[PDB]
Design a protein around this nucleic acid. Structure first.
Ligand SMILES: [Zn+2]
Lengths: 158, 263, 96, 346
RNA sequence: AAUU
DNA sequence: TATAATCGAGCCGGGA
DNA sequence: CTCCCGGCAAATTGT
């Protein structure tokens, strides 16, 4: 309402510019509700769709990223590498602005491992802590797919 | 150890222990570094070859990896893996956009302008036109990514009581609400340390909420009010088309002092 | 529409007619005092009931709507004078 | 290309837990919280601050941000200081750090392993005003709650405890977010009750029930007036962009007058009135014109009592009543003479 | 859906 | 707050 | 080529 704060402490134009302490509302023309903007502070930055999806994409064009690549990074289908930190994948070093899948990112970032179920009652051939080559037999029916340290999960019998 | 004092296994006398019939065997590609005294790195820490692990500096790591401190096996595992920086979403892109030296890219692209192949010169031009746009204008490319999202003044998206005391409201209010809800939930999930799968889902949903707000239907299925097939009317829809702001309220208007009748 | 006591639509093609006649002041009236120029239409009515000539128009409110809608899209639209300095068409109401 | 399908694929990349694995993680989490409690005692550091620092190192450098309840800004400077103070503990104390660390790690894994549970619960609550993915995230929020409260000792499977927390979380979301005009959860509860009841009444009566019939069916406290007021409150707004019949060439908002901004006539009329009112008040003494302005609210917007006007001009409540009537009488005289203000009475 |  | 529950359901022109 | 997005007369009325 014109020159009237929310709670009504200051109700006329003698106060113009006052900000009511109780209710917090400015005394001015109500017309400003057509003019004054608010804003939302995002937790994560978000891309403006015009500069993504308007072809040829402006963001894609500056960064030399195709339509498909830019979609995949923006919509969380693929990682893009900012700093390889000496990473290497499949024998070749990971270079910046390279796209990694989830499996590729997890293997790089958290390492590669595998867990092998043991047929009920069957006891292991190798012992806990023992280094194992790929292809080596863990149990009568269990063969390891990768090199590394074998670890016992839940011993049923001590 | 067990739930109740009984059923516990307490050692009857002096002896040595052997483990049998494990449920599964976990093969990890990792290095094991046993330690007699105290360990200086705690579990989860990231480590490069040469970093000190336990026993005041005696034992150190041979590989790049992630620290697993085993208090049972009394060994410090290092799981082979790197401190690699790889990101998803608009945050990654905002970073790559900040890290653009447009001056350099103009130079690089001009050198590309001397190449004989027609396609080489053509693409370098289109890129160079975008580069030059930003250069001449003074706009920073990272502005194509939003951090603060503007909110249109309320009287332009009104909530008004119609004649019958009923309420009528603009579709933008619902589009903002989806945004606000998803942003707030994202803040909460961050403070509560949700797993990356959950935080990632929230982030991609946040992008879609911004997308529907700015241009609904542009990417992916259009956002609708419940139990209606009508796409909500977004900012882009308001501006453009026959019914848009330009061709409806700007290049033509309804006017006062006017009338009509049969001739 | 008649049921709302409406005004007639003076649409794009009608504006073309006023343009082809070169009737610039007639056209400006359609775009401001007889439509969405709030300050203008109020002042124009007051002048007619007082016998004065109608005043020169002000900014159409629908342009202000356009400006704010482009701000909601994170686009900065600035009305500038010949010196390329900003002109405030909101008359201080929208600036802190 | 489909956000739901995508999420379904990512959850399917975390294998479900074995009975053993479930207990191990749940166990490590409980033990880990206990470790953080002790680290509080030993160090004298807020349990939450310790928990956030432990959690920071587990999740990695990726997530570092300010946490609300915490008094200190949480940044690598403070997390190194606090982590370095924790690593400054003697071996028997420093063991609790390793436990807390493994607790956070196990919690992450426990949560991730139950995400498919949330999906199967969320799919049943669709169509109530939240999108499928919105329901999943709120359900996930509950799943996070369940992991913190779970007591593994009771030997119940996790799915049993979580389901309560997940259902609770989704239902709060629907009650909290589904309406453009937000309604308190309890009020939302009443409305749904009123709906269910009427649906029963219509199924037995073979026709729509009256307000009175619903008020009886609702029990004590309810009459028809309250049934009606409740339904009025339950009305959702309608879109200004709803298309009107014919071609899609007209929206509903276009038929709604603006009742707020004065019309050209009104602007003219009110302005002319303000000007004639002042012409008559300057023809009063300053002292007797100011009293009338204070009493009718033309100054400050409030109509002041007789006692208050006495305090500002420092006179008696009866004196102020007297100058108002003589002021108003003199005003009345100038009016009968100039006929200026008569036409504004409509 | 009408009128021109 | 504790049985257990664990992956959805119109024709047309122009430009990358 | 194929696909993906942008266009596709005006004013008026009526339930
Ligand atoms: Zn106030």
């Amino acid at each position: 309402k014109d020159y009237e704060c929310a709670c009504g402490k200051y109700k006329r134009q003698r106060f113009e510019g006052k900000v009511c302490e109780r209710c917090g509302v400015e005394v001015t023309k109500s017309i400003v509700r057509r003019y004054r903007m608010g804003h939302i502070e995002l937790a994560t930055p978000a891309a403006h769709i015009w500069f993504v999806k308007d072809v040829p994409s402006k963001i894609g064009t500056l960064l030399d990223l195709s339509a498909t690549e830019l979609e995949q990074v923006l919509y969380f289908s693929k990682y893009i590498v900012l700093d390889p930190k000496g990473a290497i994948l499949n024998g070749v070093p990971v270079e910046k602005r390279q796209l990694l899948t989830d499996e590729e990112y997890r293997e790089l970032r958290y390492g590669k491992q595998e867990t092998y179920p043991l047929p009920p009652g069957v006891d292991a051939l190798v012992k806990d802590g023992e280094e194992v080559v790929k292809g080596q037999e863990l149990a009568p029916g269990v063969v390891s797919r990768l090199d590394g340290v074998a670890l016992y999960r839940f011993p049923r019998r001590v | 150890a067990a739930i109740d004092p009984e059923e516990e296994v307490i050692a009857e006398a002096e002896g040595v222990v052997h483990l049998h019939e494990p449920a599964s065997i976990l093969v990890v590609k990792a290095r094991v570094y046993p330690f007699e005294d105290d360990v200086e790195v705690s579990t989860g820490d990231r480590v490069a070859p040469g970093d000190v692990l336990a026993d005041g500096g005696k034992v150190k790591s041979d590989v790049y990896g992630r620290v697993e401190v085993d208090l049972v096996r009394n060994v410090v595992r290092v799981v082979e893996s790197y401190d690699i920086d790889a990101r998803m979403g608009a945050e990654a892109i905002q970073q790559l956009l900040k890290e653009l030296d447009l001056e350099a890219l103009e130079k690089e692209l001009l050198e590309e302008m001397k190449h004989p192949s027609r396609a080489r010169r053509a693409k370098a031009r289109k890129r160079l036109e975008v580069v030059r746009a930003f250069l001449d204008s003074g706009n920073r490319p990272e502005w194509m990514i939003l951090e603060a999202v503007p909110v249109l003044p309320p009287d332009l998206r009104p909530m008004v009581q119609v004649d019958g005391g009923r309420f009528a409201t603009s579709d933008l209010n619902d589009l903002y609400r989806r945004l606000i809800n998803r942003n707030n939930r994202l803040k909460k999930l961050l403070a509560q340390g949700a797993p990356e799968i959950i935080i990632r889902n929230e982030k991609r949903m946040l992008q879609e909420a911004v997308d529907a707000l700015l241009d609904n239907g542009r990417r992916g299925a259009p956002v609708t009010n419940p139990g209606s097939d009508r796409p909500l009317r977004s900012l882009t829809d308001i501006l453009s088309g026959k019914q848009g702001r330009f061709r409806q309220n700007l290049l033509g208007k309804r006017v006062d002092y006017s009338g009509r009748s049969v001739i | 529409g008649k049921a709302q006591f409406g005004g007639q639509r003076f649409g794009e093609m009608e504006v073309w007619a006023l343009e082809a006649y070169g009737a610039a002041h007639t056209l400006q009236e359609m775009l401001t005092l007889k439509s969405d120029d709030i300050e203008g239409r109020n002042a124009a009515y007051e002048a007619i009931i007082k016998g004065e000539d109608v005043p020169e128009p002000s900014v159409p409110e629908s342009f202000r709507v356009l400006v704010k809608e482009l701000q909601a899209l994170a686009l900065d639209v600035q009305t500038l004078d010949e010196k390329d300095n900003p002109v405030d068409i909101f008359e201080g109401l929208a600036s802190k | 290309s489909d956000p739901v399908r995508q999420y379904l694929h990512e959850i399917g990349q975390v294998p479900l837990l074995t009975l053993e694995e479930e207990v191990e993680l749940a166990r490590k989490v409980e033990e880990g919280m206990e470790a953080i409690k002790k680290l509080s005692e030993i160090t004298g550091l807020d349990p939450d601050l310790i928990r956030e620092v432990v959690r920071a190192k587990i999740l990695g450098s990726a997530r570092v941000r300010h946490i609300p309840g915490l008094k200190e800004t949480l940044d690598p400077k403070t997390v190194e200081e606090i982590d370095q103070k924790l690593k400054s503990l003697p071996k028997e104390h420093k063991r609790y750090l390793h436990i807390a660390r493994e607790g956070e790690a196990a919690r992450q894994h426990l949560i991730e392993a139950n995400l498919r549970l949330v999906v199967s619960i969320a799919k049943k609550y669709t169509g109530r005003g939240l999108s499928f993915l919105d329901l999943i995230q709120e359900g996930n929020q509950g799943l996070i709650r369940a992991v913190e409260k779970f007591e593994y000792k009771r030997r119940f499977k996790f799915s049993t405890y979580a389901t309560w927390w997940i259902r609770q979380a989704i239902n709060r979301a629907i009650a909290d977010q589904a309406r453009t005009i937000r309604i308190p959860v309890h009020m939302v509860e009443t409305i749904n009750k009123l709906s269910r009841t009427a649906r029963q009444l219509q199924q037995e009566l073979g026709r729509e029930p009256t307000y009175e019939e619903i008020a009886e069916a609702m029990g004590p406290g309810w009459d028809a007036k309250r049934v009606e007021e409740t339904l009025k409150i339950a009305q959702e707004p309608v879109s200004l962009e709803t298309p009107i019949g014919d071609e899609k060439d007209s929206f509903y908002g276009d038929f709604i007058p603006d009742e707020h901004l004065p019309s050209p006539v009104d602007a003219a009329t009110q302005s002319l009135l303000s000007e004639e009112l002042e012409k008559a008040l300057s023809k009063l003494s300053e002292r007797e014109a100011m009293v009338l302005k204070l009493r009718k609210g033309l100054i400050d917007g409030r109509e002041h009592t007789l006692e208050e006007v006495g305090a500002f001009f420092g006179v008696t409540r009866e004196r102020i009543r007297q100058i108002e009537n003589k002021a108003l009488r003199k005003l009345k005289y100038h009016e009968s003479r100039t006929r200026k203000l008569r036409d504004f009475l409509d």
